[PDB]
Symmetry: D2
Subunit: 462 residues, 4 copies
């Protein structure tokens, strides 16, 4: 009568517990305060975690130690990181076409950034779990509790949908798993083929209005590829695409339910978060003595920390001390998100002081989150131009210092959406109402995210 | 509602999907309007609701992997590869766990290296996994008086009436579980678990801790010297291509298979409907009515399919299944799965094979030695003797040598766990032992140890 | 007393004869008149051939059927031919440094031409046997019998050195074999490495005076390579360099002494000239009813015919009928050498008529031989500018017709010689006396031959 | 002058070549000023003329291939590869022909696949070829009264005085021939002759047409199932790396080796003198004087070297050869080649091996079972019994198992032709049979068939 189906969550027997020592450590760490947590009752949360402790993981430990070695390259200045995908994944759009479109977009950026940087690009999707977000107000504009992502409540704007229901924990796992399944299939398919991927770049250059501007680079990359193949490289000679899953580690009941211990064949058991390959802690949940930082300390996965305009060099050094106590290159990524009017002035002393610690972090640019604003026509938006200028400024600080602009972190879709302003298409304030589809922040659309790749490429070539 | 131990999914904001090519629609409706044996008895409206939820989820498999399976099966069909099919009789939601999945995968990779060495040719590996959650039943009421367990897609194993109701909510749980497991098998097959060298040191633990170990040793040593020869000639792990394990299950519940249909793109011809719940599916002895929906549905999908053939099979009906399901003469499109009993395969198969070979089509001939050799023990549990299974395969091989056709593969029920379900083996599991670790939700599976011991036994039939 | 050593030619037992049928055919073919043959007596020539009939070949049949398949690509428009090396090899300079320098030069041209054509480049060295040449006069300027190449007489300008001595037949074999030995070793060594090879191109661009002009292409190719390697290609993934030996088939006593029959494992025995992989017949020895054309007819090797300004479409069709009777793509190369003032007008009707035969020949440009002239300062020379303009004109005819400019055929050295005029260095008439080292025609030197590659690349990119 | 059956080469316009690094010059002159056994007795001025002709010709080998050989020999030295060395006792100009070269190469590739399979590790292949044209002699006058045949670099086989004069013109003929053959072996090893699969069907013709065939069959079948397993796992010809056969000869004639010295570039450290007449060279029992030129010359070149050690060897002198020739402790720089007799290897080798192992250097231990087991037949020809050769290798293996050191390889005299030079084998070649096809210019070689039969015999010693 209400267009809903109820799926019973199966109550299945448990596997053995994690060992008691690591449990003792994890418990000590999660007694710390945790910001932004759902407000569901403990018994229900407890119940839902118990279901997730025995489900097949989303990732496995070997992929994560592989990601760790690729990231060390990045930290040593010999590889570049690309991380990008939906601001918020929703369950409704966790469909083959949308997932295929974001995977394409990302591989499309990747070949352009690879040519331009002249080194490997490690590809990290914001996918298979980006279902939770913070909020600054518990009351939104409609006078409702805030949407906090599909792992927590519903986007629909009513009270019943907005209550925090922990059965969304198991709904998230399911969608994460199904999405992961599909990204592994698509990355071992013809979709990954370099030759394919950059014929899209060429359809892009034909159809775009700033197309004349990018033709030269597009033709060069093309000739690059034609030269690979003329020298006898065919696609089975490359070893296949690797696209890694990441999300913000926000909801501790989910992340800790997804903890596992590794074979001990690799060598030495340890705790991995198998909800994803790498995760990051956000600007609202990175309190130095908080449950999120503590949790990142305990997990073997590479981690990242979002660093905003209020950040001090001294808080940054503490992150490095807390999150890279063994000095492992690429274990910690520090993510700059300052605004394009501020990165040139604010980032430099942060880098100087962290570089002096003797540790090797990855410096990655997030040119989105610092540069958001509301248009006169209602919608929340970002100016493409300001986004570009932030990557520009981040490259300029790294050049001036001799450190390595390690990568970017961007919110993008393969959809032809009208969320961010400007770009070649100069989406205006008027155009935002046509296809404003984000469940949260404004995403660069397919064309804009590509255009940005071209522009970051020319930056890597200087 | 975690309060009601349910996940709540709304259907109303699932937005209309592209219509099918007109003919494909006409043929699909035509196939599904035909009588269908062994379907669940749940309401049409609840089913529909659940089908609609599954129409928009991520597929378990993609078309490119299915076209690739066809090319590999083509080779088996031409006598230049061999087919290994194996896994649980019935996967349950309860044991869809990393340990169980990983054991199953291991047992398959382990068998496959042995079979590769014995065959001197490639082995294609197709797991019964990520959807084998439905079974037929010859009687709707079981020995306890209860509506029969039909597998976890349909009802629950628990021996009570209420668990036995047919529940369409199981269509979405079966998918969730199927997705989750496929995601893990893909993770496993491109890890160190797939490296042939590790994979065969498990077989050597097996030879040393095994009552029949002295029997299988020479061949295990030979395989090992194979692997080291390979490596000594410069072949390293990353010079190989990583392992491919395909998913298969019986295509039984037409509500599930139809909701999992998808239409392929332009980049490989005219568009076609693929069943994206699996790589390849087969049709069982009870649902293989020549004019029924299962056969009709098999003819609309592009996947490789199989059909089970038991002891009342005729050479004439076999030919009819080949001309219906492989109408384009595409080798490896169709496997014929023989399951006769060991006391009958020697006499009943050859004429089915002569007549099929005469058509000019190239089917894969595969042996299912499980399902014709089942008996009930004196203690209470239904079981199969290991010697009868072996013998059926032996006879399946004598049939083909004598005709000069290709014994193309085996289809077995196995598990990575040392259950005590099948009598005999090196372990000589007795009737008394069967009470110990009988864990199957349906048929008796071969042991970790018995399923390996059988790879060794068939690897030597391949060598003669 | 005269600074000479006499090496006895060993009189060794024979192996079995070639089969009688093929012998009967070969004899019928060599009864035809043969121009430009040495004038040594028959008994001595006979004696020296008998020595060569049993010596290890210079090439083996499988390499030649491999060359045949690579050349078919070229003829079908999907690969480009580069052929280049000394105008005349001499024994004196058949040294590791000179051989290494010509092999480098050629691989250096090859990567530039590969990038520029966007398809494979088949590399054919004028080497391991280019020891014989024609002459138009039997009397040279010093009043001596003409130098005719080291397989025939000595370059030194005296009577005793200029007599035709057939012991030079066995001296040629030796030098050919030793040179071949070294090109196989160098092509399986680090010398072949794409990355190495084009760092020479970059030293070239730094040090050359037209360097600014070629920087862009040089940087692009560089980025191409850096992109290959960033995508995970390392040198063991390419399968190694293949440099084939060719020379003009001029001296029939040598070429027929080097005939062999193939295993018959490949399938079907047949006659191969195992003095080289491919050979060509020159403009002075290509009489339609002559011994050279007949000899090319009988051998399985790919062959080429030099076509000059006197050539008619109808003589060209006859070559195709004579030399490609089975319609095998790339069995016959037709080599255009017309002069840069004439190729645009003279080549086109030749191509039209041969293309209409339905056969698939390779059209290759020889921009050297048509464009030679003597300077006021004594030396015989060619103008770089005229050489370039000839390739230009050959590309223009092929474009206009829709046929495939299949390749070039050039006389080059790795030495820093001063033989050809102009180029970036603008070697003048005055500069020719500094390093005029050719035993015959003026070679493009290392810099000029590279510059020409760059220029032919830009032609292939239009 | 084809009139005088000579090729005439002028020396006067051979233009001065870069001087050597001062120390390298000093050390080279120092080594060559030391007494030198077994050198030809030709004039200094004619020699000089010929050395000058060879100073400017194309090398037989290039330095990169020699550094690559060292890395491969390092592995043998560490117990993870095996060394196969084989070819003619004496190459002659007369049989430096395609058929003869091709037979030799085949016989080596054939042995090498068998040995690879038996060792379960890589086999490095070093032919005696492209320069093995000189031999020592214990007496300058032979049984006919003639100045002894010293190999084709020095004089002629023909039994007449004038052919027996030492002729320095042979230094250039030896190079021409060496070049020509190396060119062909490089052509052959990157053709279909090198593909492992063809290469082992020759071994199967061998098993079927052979009196001992029933003996070697199981192992030939095993090898074949190895090769097909390899191919079934996706390994194709072009996924392998093509065959590498290295050239070696005894470094005997110091006029030849010194004219073939060359100096390496910058791109691998400080420049060094390489002997570019070969990949690796060894020093024989007669020229291995500790303070002599051969040893002194070995210490100046960068190539891997070997030294032969016969029955009057001490553990102390062996240590001295290791500290002189492998002064940098570089594994695989030095091979010690044991050639004791089968009746002595069991007792005389172990103490040489203990003392060498104690130094901390890593030599390759290689067995030459040919040169200690030679006798004169009752019919006229000097010969070796096949059983004695086998036994020496057997004992060489018992020495190393018992110490836990690595039996690193064999160094054998073989040919692709069925000569009748060595008594016994499966063929049981008798004394009477030896007259049939005795063709060697020096020592008795193993047959095509005997050299294969020995790979099988050693492959099984490697398996125990
Ligand atoms: Cl319906
Ligand atoms: Cl001297
Ligand atoms: Mn966002
Ligand atoms: Mn079953
Ligand atoms: Mn010329
Ligand atoms: Mn000897």
């Amino acid at each position: 009568m209400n267009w809903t189906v109820d799926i019973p969550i199966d109550q299945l027997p448990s596997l053995p517990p994690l060992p008691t020592d690591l449990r003792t450590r994890l418990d000590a760490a999660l007694a710390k305060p945790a910001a932004q947590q759902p407000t569901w009752p403990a018994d229900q949360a407890l119940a839902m975690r118990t279901v997730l402790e025995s489900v097949p993981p989303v990732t496995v430990p070997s992929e994560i130690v592989r990601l760790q070695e690729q990231l060390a390259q990045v930290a040593k200045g010999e590889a570049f990181l690309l991380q990008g995908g939906d601001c918020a994944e929703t369950f409704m759009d966790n469909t083959e076409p949308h997932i295929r479109g974001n995977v394409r977009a990302l591989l499309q950026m990747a070949v352009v950034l690879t040519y331009g940087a002249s080194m490997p690009v490690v590809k990290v999707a914001r996918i298979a779990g980006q279902y939770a977000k913070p909020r600054s107000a518990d009351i939104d504009a409609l006078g409702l509790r805030s949407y906090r992502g599909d792992m927590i409540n519903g986007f629909a704007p009513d009270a019943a949908a907005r209550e925090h229901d922990p059965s969304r924990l198991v709904r998230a796992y399911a969608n994460a798993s199904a999405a992961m399944n599909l990204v592994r299939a698509l990355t071992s398919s013809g979709l990954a083929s370099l030759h394919l991927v950059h014929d899209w770049n060429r359809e892009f250059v034909r159809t775009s209005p700033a197309g004349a501007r990018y033709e030269a680079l597009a033709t060069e990359i093309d000739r690059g590829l034609r030269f690979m193949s003329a020298c006898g490289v065919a696609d089975r000679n490359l070893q296949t695409a690797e696209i890694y899953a990441s999300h913000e580690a926000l909801v501790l009941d989910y992340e800790r339910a997804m903890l596992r211990l590794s074979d001990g064949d690799d060598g030495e058991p340890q705790l991995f978060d198998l909800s994803a390959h790498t995760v990051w802690i956000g600007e609202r949940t990175r309190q130095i003595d908080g449950a999120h930082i503590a949790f990142a300390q305990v997990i073997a996965n590479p981690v990242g920390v979002k660093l905003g305009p209020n950040m001090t060099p001294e808080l940054a050094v503490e992150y490095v001390e807390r999150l890279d106590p063994h000095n492992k290159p690429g274990r910690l990524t520090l993510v700059s998100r300052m605004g394009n009017h501020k990165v040139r002035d604010l980032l430099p002393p942060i880098v100087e002081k962290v570089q002096a610690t003797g540790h090797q972090v990855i410096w990655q640019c997030d040119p989105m989150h610092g540069n958001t604003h509301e248009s006169s026509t209602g919608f929340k938006t970002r100016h493409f131009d300001r986004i570009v200028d932030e990557v520009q400024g981040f490259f300029e600080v790294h050049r001036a210092l001799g450190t390595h602009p390690g990568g970017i972190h961007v919110e993008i879709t393969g959809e032809n959406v009208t969320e961010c302003l400007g770009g070649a298409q100069d989406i205006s304030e008027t155009d935002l109402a046509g296809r404003y589809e984000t469940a949260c922040d404004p995403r660069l659309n397919t064309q804009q995210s590509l255009e940005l790749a071209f522009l970051v490429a020319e930056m890597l070539r200087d």
